[PDB]
């Protein structure tokens, strides 16, 4: 558990 | 210059009830109507001893992003015997069930189901089938303002892991846009 | 040396500013020229007349040809 | 979903023509390109690169944040600077100095 | 006395204010006296002061570790608006 | 019911009475002195023009914008033509358009025909003028005349062939940008435009001159041949290295920025360009690091991944400082990242966090106190001018202009003390001491007089003076300037402080100000999103350095973990400048390599270290901003400081007797950006 937003930002910086 | 006799005694017998605009320029004369009445105008039309059209040319839908009625519907048909053709435009938005014609010129069910799946004017009677141009099943309305030039999910390719397959567009080498206007 | 390295990949044989480095100047008798090369069209290179008051050759904006006043 | 701006494209700064200001217009700020390797062109995977400022032009602002709304898509309008119009003169030009001091 | 020994654990603390009426009657006052000599005598707590359009005048206290503690001050008088800072102070 | 041109506020100054002509027939009112011109534009006609700009002095001199006024003889030149009450203009009549065919035969026929070489090549006037209003056939075979090109330094190439004789130039390097060298020599056909001694032109605004020029022959050098306009596409943004916030727009193809022309903004700055700012961005290209990287301890860099680094930085962090952790903010930095910086520090506990120029003393914090309150355009009315410790001239451009642009117009008395400068409009020089600003502040110096026998008088103090030890001093004097000399009255606040960064409004907004002085000296983990901290060096031997910025070019060799971040032209935040209005910044270009924003780095670094923030997208940041500061989310509107300068002193003694220091040097090594590139590394080599 790593609160999506941390997952979304190892991939790239568009979400 | 053309057709002003035909254009002229048409409205002048006219119900004139059911138009709401009348334009005889030199381009094309416009009667422009309400989508309640469509229908009866044109079966008014094709029937009358003295303006019969007879054959419809064309349905062609017109697309204009900024008004509170969007699309424009189109019925450019003219008259074999009395060498004149007009052009009968009426207004429709997103959905408003608009009348059919299949009734009266069997050459409407292409035209209009081209107009159902380029565009997204409905038709309540028949000629409402499945789309036509476009291949199957289909994101939006392809010639709309808003479906872009290069679509939504169109990457389509072979997959030797099973056999072929439609993915989203990541295509190279962007549509460039030019500007090219002129500010006098 | 940069540009033609950007563009050209050979690097053998010399490259357009090379020649055109090769190619000598002109040394004109007048004031002022115009340069299309010998015809007026099928060799473009619309007029563009240029001046000639200066001790160096003057370049033409379109192959350059480097035209050069004779006398004083 | 995504975030647009509507905004008026301001006078180019290079000219001095007016047939191409108040005119109401929304941008997708979407800016996700990278370099060809093979050739070097510009490519890209948004569908709206482009159409935002291509195609869709509106009449007014009202239009364009009815139209937004419409697709759902949340906005966020932005200002329109318009040119002060003082007064000049020929003669303020031609002005005349004082007297010695 | 306690207006010199509120700088305990009171790092930051900053009143949010409008430029209009329902905060004009206790807020500025308020603000203007006690800013004056607070700030003489607390020589080192930042104590802010933020005005935008449009907005309830409210308290707001900045405590150590960042815990925020906020006071809402819609219809109060100087005296309970005192009395509502000494209560920020004081925390234990 | 006419709009005028693109929306044109009329003044209407005496609202009484305005006279009322007919343009074209229907009938349009119009101010009492406007010129035809501008009335034929009220009433919503564009007519064609070459040498009138709005903003410089009027001269009948391209003899295109003729019209036929009728009650009058046959031709008549629209601008410089003052109207009358009922005159009949008239503009679309065979009188005017045969003027307008011949006068543009005229220019064609003695014109060089080197369009497809000749950048401007799709944004010409003379170009778009013919095409729309000129003939279609030319009739001439002679030989033309044709004359050397001319260099200007390394920013305004010219090739002079097609110099057709304007004198907009002329006209705007002799009112605007206050250097009088270029200038139009020769007669009749054989008439140039240049320095008759081959010098060049060491001023700012010259990138204005580029823009003023119509015709493609003063042409940025950087920008030789690289685009035509139809290529490329505009971004409307700020700007970040001055401190006005000017409004530019980012011209942009693929991920490369092209150029930066500004957009016409009648609040910050009216339709110019400060020199720094329109080349900035070739580095911004050029140099750049794109990889968090982390010091292998043979004092290398090694590339890593995310995970890693944020784990090292947060494990480190908790480890070892119990009270020691600073904080710096970045000279261009965004609200977003500096509340979230703050929140992060604050929820780590340990607290020691500050702007980039903002002074280690107090810094008392009274919105009134430390931003520009006469706003820009309001300055245009002052009458006196007590401009303390600055040179605008190299910070605030834009400010600069606009002083000069009110003593232009009206003959307003100038006094600046600090240090020797070269001011271009007749300043007086009252001295070098907060001594002298003592004894005006008293009755001595009788400059002070001035002030009592003045109306809207100004004030100006540069920020410079936050980072000098005694500040309440100066600032006390002020204000007893204030009250005796009547300044601050409810119906004009004639009390401005200028700032000299994009990010210092927004940090003292805030609240970044360091709460010891000591600070770099006594830390052990330092977080820097700016460089410089005192020559980088007051951070001791041992201290974990972690800058998380961009365009590393300086204090990077002191960083000892690197996190790559997102430039101005690659993110959307809010930059608030000196008037106090908050204005925010578009994404131009993609971000560079895989470096991220700053407020995302700061919550997935607080994630990682523990203790999270509650907020993970832009909205709940500006939420938070609200709960803050509210402005900041009321963004794009000035919301003036109604609260006066009550602060309390605690110097009481003088003002410490020492010389005011030089804020800014070179203005252009300056703003790290600028720096690290490069143009404005050849024109402070040679251009000054
Ligand atoms: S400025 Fe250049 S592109 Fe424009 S008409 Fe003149 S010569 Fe041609
Ligand atoms: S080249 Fe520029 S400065 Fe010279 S006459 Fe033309 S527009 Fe004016
Ligand atoms: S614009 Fe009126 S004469 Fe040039
Ligand atoms: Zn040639």
């Not at chain 6, 401009?387 to 606009?402: D, H, K, S, Y």
């Amino acid at each position: 558990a790593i609160s999506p937003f941390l997952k979304n930002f190892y991939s790239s910086n568009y979400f | 210059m053309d057709n002003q006799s035909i254009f002229k005694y048409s409205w002048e017998t006219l119900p004139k009830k059911w138009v709401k605009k009348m334009e005889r320029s030199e381009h094309g004369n416009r009667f422009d109507t309400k989508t309640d009445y469509l229908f009866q105008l044109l079966c008014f039309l094709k029937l009358h001893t003295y303006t019969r059209v007879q054959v419809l040319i064309d349905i062609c839908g017109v697309d204009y992003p900024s008004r509170k009625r969007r699309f424009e519907v189109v019925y450019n048909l003219l008259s074999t015997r009395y060498n004149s053709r007009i052009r009968v435009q009426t207004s429709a938005d997103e959905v408003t069930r608009i009348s059919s014609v299949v009734s009266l010129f069997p050459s409407a069910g292409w035209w209009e189901r081209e107009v159902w799946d380029m565009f997204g004017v409905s038709s309540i009677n028949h000629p409402d089938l499945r789309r036509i141009l476009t291949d199957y099943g289909f994101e939006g309305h392809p010639l709309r303002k808003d479906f872009p030039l290069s679509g939504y999910v169109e990457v389509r390719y072979d997959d030797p892991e099973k056999r072929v397959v439609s993915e989203p567009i990541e295509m190279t080498q962007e549509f460039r846009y030019f500007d090219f206007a002129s500010p006098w | 040396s940069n540009h033609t390295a950007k563009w050209m990949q050979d690097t053998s044989k010399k490259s357009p500013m090379e020649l055109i480095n090769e190619v000598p100047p002109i040394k004109v008798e007048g004031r002022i020229v115009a340069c299309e090369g010998d015809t007026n069209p099928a060799l473009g290179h619309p007029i563009e007349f240029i001046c000639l008051d200066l001790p160096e050759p003057a370049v033409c904006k379109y192959c350059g040809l480097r035209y050069v006043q004779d006398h004083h | 979903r995504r975030r647009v701006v509507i905004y008026s494209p301001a006078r180019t700064a290079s000219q001095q023509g007016s047939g191409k200001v108040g005119r109401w217009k929304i941008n997708f700020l979407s800016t996700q390109k990278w370099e060809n390797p093979l050739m070097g062109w510009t490519s890209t995977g948004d569908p709206y690169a482009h159409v935002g400022d291509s195609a869709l032009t509106f009449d007014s602002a009202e239009a364009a944040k009815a139209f937004a709304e419409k697709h759902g898509w949340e906005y966020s309008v932005k200002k329109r600077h318009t040119p002060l119009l003082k007064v000049k003169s020929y003669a303020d030009n031609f002005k005349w100095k004082g007297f010695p001091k | 006395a306690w207006r010199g020994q509120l700088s305990k654990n009171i790092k930051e603390l900053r009143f949010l204010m409008c430029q209009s009426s329902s905060a004009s009657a206790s807020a500025r006052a308020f603000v203007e006296k006690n800013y004056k000599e607070l700030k003489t005598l607390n020589p080192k707590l930042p104590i802010l002061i933020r005005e935008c359009s449009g907005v309830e005048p409210q308290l707001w206290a900045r405590y150590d570790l960042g815990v925020e503690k906020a006071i809402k001050l819609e219809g109060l008088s100087e005296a309970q608006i005192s009395k509502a800072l000494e209560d920020l102070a004081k925390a234990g | 019911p006419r709009s005028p041109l693109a929306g044109a506020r009329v003044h209407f100054a005496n609202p009484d009475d305005a006279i009322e002509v007919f343009v074209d027939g229907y009938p349009v009112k119009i101010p009492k002195g406007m010129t035809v011109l501008q009335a034929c534009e009220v009433a919503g006609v564009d007519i064609p023009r070459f040498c009138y700009h709005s903003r410089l002095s009027i001269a009948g001199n391209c003899r295109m914008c003729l019209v036929e006024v009728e009650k009058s003889p046959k031709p008549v030149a629209s601008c410089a033509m003052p109207a009358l009450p009922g005159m009949k203009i008239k503009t679309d009549t065979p009188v005017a358009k045969k003027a307008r065919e011949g006068v543009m035969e005229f220019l064609l026929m003695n014109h060089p025909l080197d369009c497809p070489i000749c950048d401007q090549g799709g944004e010409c006037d003379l170009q778009d003028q013919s095409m729309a209003f000129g003939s279609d056939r030319g009739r001439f075979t002679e030989v033309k005349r044709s004359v050397v090109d001319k260099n200007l330094g390394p920013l305004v190439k010219t090739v002079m062939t097609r110099c057709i004789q304007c004198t907009r130039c002329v006209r705007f390097a002799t009112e605007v940008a206050g250097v009088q060298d270029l200038g139009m020599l020769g007669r009749g056909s054989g008439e140039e435009i240049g320095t008759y001694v081959e010098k060049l032109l060491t001023s700012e605004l010259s990138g204005n001159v580029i823009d003023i020029c119509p015709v493609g022959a003063l042409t940025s050098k950087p920008f030789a041949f690289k685009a035509r306009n139809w290529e490329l596409k505009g971004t409307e943004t700020i700007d970040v290295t001055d401190a006005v916030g000017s409004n530019i727009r980012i011209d942009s193809r693929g991920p490369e920025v092209m150029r930066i022309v500004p957009r016409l903004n009648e609040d910050i700055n009216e339709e110019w360009i400060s020199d720094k700012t329109r080349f900035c961005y070739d580095g911004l290209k050029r140099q750049r690091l794109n990889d968090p990287m982390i010091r292998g301890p043979d004092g290398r860099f090694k590339a890593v991944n995310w995970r890693d680094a944020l784990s090292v930085i947060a494990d480190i962090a908790h480890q070892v400082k119990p009270e020691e952790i600073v904080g710096v903010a970045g000279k261009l930095s965004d609200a977003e990242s500096m509340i979230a910086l703050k929140d992060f520090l604050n929820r780590m506990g340990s607290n020691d966090v500050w702007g980039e120029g903002i002074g280690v003393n107090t810094n008392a914090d009274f919105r009134s106190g430390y931003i520009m309150n006469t706003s820009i355009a309001g300055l245009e009315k002052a009458d006196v001018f007590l401009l303390v410790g600055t040179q605008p001239r190299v910070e605030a451009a834009m400010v600069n202009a606009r002083i000069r642009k009110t003593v232009r117009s009206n003959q307003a008395k100038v006094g600046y003390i600090g240090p020797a400068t070269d001011f271009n409009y007749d300043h007086k020089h009252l001295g070098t001491d907060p001594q002298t600003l003592v004894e005006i502040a008293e009755g001595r110096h009788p400059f002070f007089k001035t002030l009592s026998d003045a109306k809207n008088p100004v004030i100006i103090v540069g920020a410079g003076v936050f980072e000098r030890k005694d500040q309440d001093a100066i600032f006390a004097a002020v204000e007893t300037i204030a009250q005796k000399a009547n300044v601050v009255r409810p119906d004009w606040n004639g009390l401005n402080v200028l700032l000299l960064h994009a990010a210092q409004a927004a940090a003292l907004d805030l609240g970044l100000v360091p709460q010891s002085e000591k600070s770099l000296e006594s830390a052990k983990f330092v977080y820097l999103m700016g460089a410089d901290d005192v020559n980088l060096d007051k951070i001791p031997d041992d201290a974990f350095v972690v800058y998380q910025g961009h365009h590393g070019d300086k204090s990077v060799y002191r960083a000892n973990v690197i996190l790559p971040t997102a430039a101005f032209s690659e993110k959307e935040g809010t930059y608030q400048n000196t008037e106090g209005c908050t204005q925010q910044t578009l994404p131009a270009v993609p971000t560079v390599g895989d470096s991220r924003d700053d407020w995302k780095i700061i919550r997935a670094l607080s994630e990682v270290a523990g203790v999270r923030l509650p907020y993970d997208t832009i909205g709940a940041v500006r939420a938070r901003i609200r709960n803050v500061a509210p402005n900041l989310v009321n963004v794009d509107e000035r919301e003036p400081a109604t609260l006066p300068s009550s602060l309390r002193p605690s110097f009481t003694q003088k003002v410490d007797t020492t010389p005011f220091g030089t804020v800014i040097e070179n203005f252009y090594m300056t703003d790290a950006i600028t720096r690290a590139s490069k143009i404005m590394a050849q024109c402070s080599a040679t251009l000054l």
